[PDB]
Amino acid sequence: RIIVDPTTGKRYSRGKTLGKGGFAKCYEMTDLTNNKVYAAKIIPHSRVSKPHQREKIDKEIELHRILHHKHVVQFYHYFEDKENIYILLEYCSRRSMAHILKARKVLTEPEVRYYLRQIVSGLKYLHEQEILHRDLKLGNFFINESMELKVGDFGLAARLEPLEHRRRTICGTPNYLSPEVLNKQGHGAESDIWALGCVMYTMLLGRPPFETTNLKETYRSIREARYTMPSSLLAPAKHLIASMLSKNPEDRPSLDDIIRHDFFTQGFTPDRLSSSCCHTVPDFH
């Protein structure tokens, strides 16, 4: 199917479906003017009929479009016709880390380092743009043909605010809600670091440190930041996790601290992972 941008000319060719993404049906989409393929979100206007959800995609577009970094999903272009909103993004042929961990259950430490360094790289970039991601999770770590990680899904992203004028209600339904968010202090950069500690824990253990049902029954355990630290963890992994999941947001490490922690500097890390790592445990050393 040929899709024309009524604003510019510009013709696109719709390829195979990639599946559902919230408000969107997702497709391969080729810009016929470079002949390059992008991952497209196609959202019918009927899915954004309410002003609040109209405002939701608009902000996603506004924030995402200004980002350029090797470990952030590259926004290409967006347009609309009478039927749909089209958001064309960097095509990542090897799905996400959610798909990888589902298959692998648990990852090796050099792999955890490989992926985490890339997540930290992209999040660093965001935090310096004073943009908070607000839903860091394995499904939002997209993996391209070359096994490179890109942080995506800016659905819940917002510009940083000072505490005094900050939103205090839980925004959307993120994977890892953060003691300070549950204490109605709002979501800061440390809340992204929370979610990064939960990610690392999940990569190593195959399950989150706290329940992720977002039910009010789980709030106390999260606020208290009490969890099982399994003995299977190596000591440096244990220490870095512990620091990222500090109860008090002020006690958590900076991003520069995180990648300079012993967990990273005292282990081997590949420059490149093979795609077999999506399915199979890699060889030693």
Ligand SMILES: CC[C@@H]1C(=O)N(C)c2cncnc2N1C1CCCC1
């Ligand atoms: C287009 C949405 C999401 C995505 O954001 N990117 C960048 C992506 C990039 N490459 C492949 N798929 C991607 N997806 C998938 C499509 C179905 C569910 C999520």
